Amino acid sequence: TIDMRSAYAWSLASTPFITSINDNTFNANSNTLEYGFKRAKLSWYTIDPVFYSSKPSGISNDDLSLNTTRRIYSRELYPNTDIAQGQIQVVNTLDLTYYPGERGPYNNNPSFGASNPSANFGGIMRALNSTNFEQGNVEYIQFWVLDPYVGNGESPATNAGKIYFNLGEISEDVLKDGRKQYENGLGPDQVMVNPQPLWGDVPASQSLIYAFDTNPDNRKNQDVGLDGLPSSREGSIYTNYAGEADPAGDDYTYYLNADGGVLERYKNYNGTEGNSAVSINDPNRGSTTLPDVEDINRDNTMSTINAYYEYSIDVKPGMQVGENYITDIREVTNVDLPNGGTTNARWIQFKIPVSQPQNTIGNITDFRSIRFMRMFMTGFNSQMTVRFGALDLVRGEWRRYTGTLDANDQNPDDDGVEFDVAAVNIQENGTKCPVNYVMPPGVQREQLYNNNTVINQNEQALAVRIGGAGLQYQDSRAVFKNVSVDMRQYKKLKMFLHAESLPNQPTLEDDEMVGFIRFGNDFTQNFY
Amino acid sequence: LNYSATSNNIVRNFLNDDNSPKEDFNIWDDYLDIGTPNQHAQQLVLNYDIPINKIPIFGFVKASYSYTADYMWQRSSTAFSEYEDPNGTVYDLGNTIQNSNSNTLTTTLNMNTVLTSIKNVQINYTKNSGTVLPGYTPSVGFLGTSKPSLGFVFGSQDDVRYEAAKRGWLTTYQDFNQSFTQVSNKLLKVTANIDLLPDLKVDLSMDRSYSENTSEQYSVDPSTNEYKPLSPYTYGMFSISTVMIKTAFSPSDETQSAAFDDFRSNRLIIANRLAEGHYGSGVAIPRYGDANNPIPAETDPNYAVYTANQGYPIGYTKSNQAVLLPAFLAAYTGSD
Amino acid sequence: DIERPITTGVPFLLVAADARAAGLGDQGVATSSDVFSQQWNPAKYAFAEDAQGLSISYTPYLTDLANDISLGQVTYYNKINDRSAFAGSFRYFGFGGIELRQTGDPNEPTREVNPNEFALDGSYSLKLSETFSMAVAARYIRSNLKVATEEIDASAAGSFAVDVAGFYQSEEIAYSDFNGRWRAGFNIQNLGPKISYDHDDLSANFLPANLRVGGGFDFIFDDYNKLGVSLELTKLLVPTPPGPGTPSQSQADEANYKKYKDIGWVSGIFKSFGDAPGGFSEELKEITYSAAAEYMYQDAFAMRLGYYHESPMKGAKQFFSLGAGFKYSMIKVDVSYLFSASKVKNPLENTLRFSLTFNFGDKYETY
Amino acid sequence: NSSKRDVNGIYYPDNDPDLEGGDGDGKLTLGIKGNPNFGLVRNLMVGVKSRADHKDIKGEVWFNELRLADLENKGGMAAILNVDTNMADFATVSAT
Amino acid sequence: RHFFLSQYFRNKYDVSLKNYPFIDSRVQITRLEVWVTNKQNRVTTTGGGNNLRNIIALQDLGEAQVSGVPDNEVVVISSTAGFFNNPIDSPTSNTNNKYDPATIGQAGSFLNSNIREIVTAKSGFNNTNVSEATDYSVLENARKLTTNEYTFNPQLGYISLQQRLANDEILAVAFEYTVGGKVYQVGEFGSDGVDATVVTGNNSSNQAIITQSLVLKMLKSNLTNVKNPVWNLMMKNVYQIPQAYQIKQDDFRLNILYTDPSPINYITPVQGSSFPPNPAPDSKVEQTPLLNVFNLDRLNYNNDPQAGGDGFFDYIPGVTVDVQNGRVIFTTKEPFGELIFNKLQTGAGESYNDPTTYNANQQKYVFRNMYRNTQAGALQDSDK
Amino acid sequence: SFYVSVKDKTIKLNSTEDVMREVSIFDISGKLLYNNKKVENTEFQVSNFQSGNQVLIVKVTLDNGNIITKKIVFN
Amino acid sequence: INQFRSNFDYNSSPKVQDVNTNFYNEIIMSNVNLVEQFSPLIRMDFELKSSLRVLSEIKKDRALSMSFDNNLLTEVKGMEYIIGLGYRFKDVIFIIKSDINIKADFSLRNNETLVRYLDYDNNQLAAGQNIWSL
């Protein structure tokens, strides 16, 4: 797995296309301020442990028992995972609080309060360290998320929506003008683009290093947000909100410098204006020291290509395993809370296969160059909190075999057969809805000593799912591995196999599916 | 004087007229058979202590000279010596010869036995050299050779290309892809000692390094046998001890730099001097804003360049290396 | 293999921290009084022969893999009268200095972290009779094994514990073939409030409260040859967590864990005993035992064999131990080695434990 | 080119009418195509095929603990003979 | 790690090495500048200087036509009508086509001055179907590689990087070479290219800054597309001998075997077929050691030609072996692809680029997919 | 002269004029977490989930049998 | 000059100006380096008769590097202050008597990297270090 739930790695996203490059659902094709008209408010964060360990003034025990603010322990999400004593026992979830009815940064919509909140979007994007998904065999996007319709601070059932994931080349021009903004190049003594580029000031010089100096006056003149305006000249550009103290909606607030509950204190934690105060003792403490730049993979170049794959997840009150890429649901019955009460909880595991995108935007054909990952929430009516207890890109050592295995078919890339390969663990799939994962009889978990603590190792099986249209009479689907194994000194080859029917599908009968091992020098000419 | 020579010959008695090995060949067939030469190397090392202390006027010098000369002859493969073009003509592409020099001079020069404060003046001078000549058709003898020149065999570094072409022992192939090559290295390490005051110890050092590599292709004209060089080019490295203490203590930060202001101002002075060197004062020096070279329209490709240096000479703008390298050196050494 | 191990906070407190006891199968509750008698039985500090003693012990971890990962111990004892003694010990487990580096101009200043875990205790021992002594010890435990990152708080977790120990040592008694000596000891260890690694009362771990009961005999022949045979029994005073099920599949396990974790340490001490429908035999699986033999020549050379057996159901720590000890003038050197006999890999395998004690001050006669 | 092979060229002894006992395994179906070698396995494949003629089957299959078993632990023998002689500082012979 | 400098050198490689160690080419690469994507972002005066430039790399820069190669796999330009302005087999040069940086926007160029700016780079093309990652790539602070970070073959026109580009990095080059008395350049060097910055005005309120890009030849693009000709610039005939650094002759043995399943040093025809009849002596397959089949054994110990070779790998420190890095280079760009395909060809109906026409001996021995696909993609062709 | 750097769960080895042959990454428990016999002075991506473990041990085998040991914190 | 070379554009053809309207140069190079080192700028080493030894030194260096590829000036400036104090208290009594040897080492290193444009005021701070230790 490659972890993706680091909050500081995510930044404000560009406006996305939904179905094709010709779809103006969120005004992604607009070359004016209308490009930002559908952006609603979104905060992405990880709740600071100071809220749980040393309660700040204005935070009560009721504020910390909501299923949107409470501390998550590993033993709740992973009851079968052993943690050594003295190590990390809490799960640091990535929390995304979405306000579809509230204005996002750099949104100059004259009529935003009268618009449908479900037509808005709130999105973040991120650069990927490894870009070759084919060489790495990146198989799916896996995430454990809290059900927002079950717990103490549950959302109303009518607040259903969608979370979209985009993988590939996604534009870094967050404020679309063709120019790369970097705020360490702003300042009264700096040269700007002589005609202002529709969002504010952009430095005319070529950037060298994405870093501030330590002069507080230069910092005050430079840390002014992605629009390049210090909130006093924003009304000139963002004319529909010139009367407000923050016309661009980009002002930053430290979560300990705000009031209210935990969610309200992180509302403006992702603002790009004023988030890099020189002194760590500032009441509006920084949260970053890096200038905000429209260059996310830090190659000095702002990419404007929009060729990516689209995957989508529904967020509805009553989701079940077998649909909506759901592979597992774990129910938590009596969660102890700091206020002395108890609450219900539901963790849902999603496995979205990367090889089966729901849509394609632009000209992308393979997974050899996947540089950016974006996720945005839309379709929601009111405030919605989504807490990723886990969010990873999962790559496997077994590769799906593409190409025909039987000469009767002769049509490999057709027939609409959904062929997925994943893993089933004792640590993650002990409550799997069709069949709970258990070890085969006689198989035991390996035991090690971490530091005077006995740790049970994970027990894993390789799961292959055939769905969609289904398998033809003599067709087969297989995964393969390149090995170097000598079997001549042993007498037996042994393997455990299990077969189950898919939920909401016709029941698989005995001796209809055949499990096969094909091993040798190849899969087409020389094999047992 | 140490002299050494190595020779490797190959015996090819097991081959037919064509490139076909002889199946029925024994390893003892012609055992005491010296073959054709394949590689030949010579090395000469001469060391001299230069007894210049004979006269009692130069009895303080302790000079010492070392000369190393290396020569190599390498036979080319039959694919080169018997190359056949698609036209069917057979060309001898020749062999390769290489030369190396390692001159070294060390002088102690005791100043003993305001100028009397100097005690010792140590001078070190190293000079390496090398010459690679491909396409050299003639072979070598059992004891060596002097065919190109006796000096070349002992590292003369004097030109032999034209003489070799005239003598007719370079390749006659007109598409020869191998390059004549030369390399030179000079290193000077002067050191002096001064005792101006009884407890004031002063050491002075001067260093200069210069390395130069030249490469060219060549042909030999079928008539008159004259050597034709083709696309000669040179590269190398340079280093020299200098002094720029005059700008050492001037403040230099992100807000101010007097030396950098001098760098900016020196560009026009250097450009004007270069323009006088190019246009030799008999005409008005053309500039980028004058009547003959007006600022073009905003859509012209050269509008920005003409506007950037309006009063500079035509061939010497602010971005010319010939303009801003002397400007940089003068600004940061404190020179005018 | 290991079915339902007992989960306790700061398990490093249960590791033998001196070569002498390690070479005797990780037992010291009823062995002869020495400078290391603080982790095992402080009550015999009143039976010391030297007035003052200091000791340094080194137990390396993962010797083949890395250096500086070790458990060190420094002990000091001073018996003031012939009846009473004070002692202070410090155990420190550390990984050594670790540099936190990004590439970032590798000449840049870097932050060094030292994740560690230490316990500092002080004990007072008093002789009640001429053959019996008691001791009370107070210990402070700190754990700082976490490294501070984003969304990770590396605040140290601390706790306090008390120790109640008793040691009986008889006088020399002549028998038919030898004039041996009898020893007995008990030690109740690590009695204190739960340690919260995450600084939340809802998530707290039991201290490794332990009970050691042991007895030993000294075969003394020729006044220059001694053979001490010692036997030790150990029981953790922490409740056993629920297992496969103790009558909604995961709901029952969740409720059982909820009721198990909501148990006080004082009540957990008594809940460790019994809690089974069976008798003494069924509870014997929670008792670890150790048997040791120490040959002593001229009180200057020591040769130690030990066997330590845990029940393979919990922990799976079964091994033999070899040990040697030497005394030059006032400096004693101990070395110990471990031969594992368990399926699970022992972290102290292929490891030579070192111990070094200095004895100074007055000398006390032994009754 | 024999008709005893499938359309994919795999030979199944269980489908051979002239072979008694099939492949020797009543539980498994064994096939071979082109001289593979389990002394050096370079390519390993696990997959699902269908046997339902007029159906489109769907489902999930778990594979676990693919392993080798029953080590052939027969031993071996070796014998060495060395004759080293020296003859009066003149000769030395060493035979192995 | 290894890239041909141009399609001209790639298509000259096989013919120029027919009679090795003699090279049937007069190319002498004299100057080379290599630029990569800058992710380090470190400014130092010691690592060869601070030479950061904006770069635009064109896939089709400097390319002319090739005699036996269709234009569609020499250049990516959608239409070549009026693109070329030199004879077909002309050596690679800036003046070969309408992408010439020296003629930017003169009368009939395909580029405007907007090609010099990163912001207006796309509008700098006079044609319609130009893509931001196919026809060109852009970098804003590209770092010039130092001479210790790469080597190059000055005769065969390819480069070898010290660090491989297994990710989305962009590779761009400018180079100058000589053929006899003629000099050719393909990119823009820092000494002959446009200035990095031009400033108009006197103070920051009215000053205009123009940052100008160097025009270079693209060798590796931001996004991998195996169907573009730039993918063919990456060499696939170089093999790194594991752990080998300073290999020397008399201390290096190499053989080619066929393991199906046992190692055999010759190739047998498929049952019911035979190898092409009456082949040339340099194209024999039947009963031929695989060293001779793959053109690696034609010389004797002294590197002199021999009738059927001496049975040993031909060790030529500039052609078949990279001595300083312990690498072995085949004498053809695709030894296990087009070379063995040609040795097994029986008629003109068989085309190497059309696998449906193979004669059932090429169907089992030609590993085309290891040259037309990535290594992970070529994993799917398990029998080759 | 040897450096190991971790930026975002990615391990980066830096050796001055020394070329490595093998790399092994172990946990504090001693379990081998990663092993590569084809080191090219490149980066390494170990599985990001390690069950609360941060400290790792990197053992590098160079050209000769010299072994370089470095303790790192996986962040 | 780390690498200079001859220019093929400097030939006998009528073409004399490049794309920047500059005359072609016979010898072309990419970078020029001016390196200056006061090592030390000043070193005062003395010892008192009271066994107090002071070794103080100021070191300085400048690393100008001008690039003709982008016509930019990269300046690396460094200063270092070192103070070493040594003293020996004599016959310090705890019956137990010993000398106390006291050593103090103070260091202050400032390093700065600037990138300077010649045509306008764009001095860029690229790297820096402001360390002191005792």
Ligand SMILES: CCCCCCCCCCC(CCCCCCCCCC)(CO[C@H]1O[C@@H](CO)[C@H](O[C@@H]2O[C@@H](CO)[C@H](O)[C@@H](O)[C@@H]2O)[C@@H](O)[C@@H]1O)CO[C@H]1O[C@@H](CO)[C@H](O[C@@H]2O[C@@H](CO)[C@H](O)[C@@H](O)[C@@H]2O)[C@@H](O)[C@H]1O
């Ligand atoms: C601050 C922190 C601790 C520093 C304190 C230093 C004290 C050193 C004590 C040394 C020690 C243990 C050393 C082993 C432990 C080291 C382990 C280290 C491991 C590191 C990993 C034995 O060491 C003995 O070695 C003998 C050499 O053979 C010497 O004998 C000497 O030779 C001649 C002199 O030349 C002399 O004439 C002769 O009379 C000596 O016999 C002495 O050095 C000493 O007696 C202690 O034993 C004995 O030392 C004496 C003082 O000597 C101590 O008396 C007290 O000391 C102070 C009380 O605090 C008070 O002030 C003091 O009033 C009081 O009298 C007692 O304790 C006593 O029991």
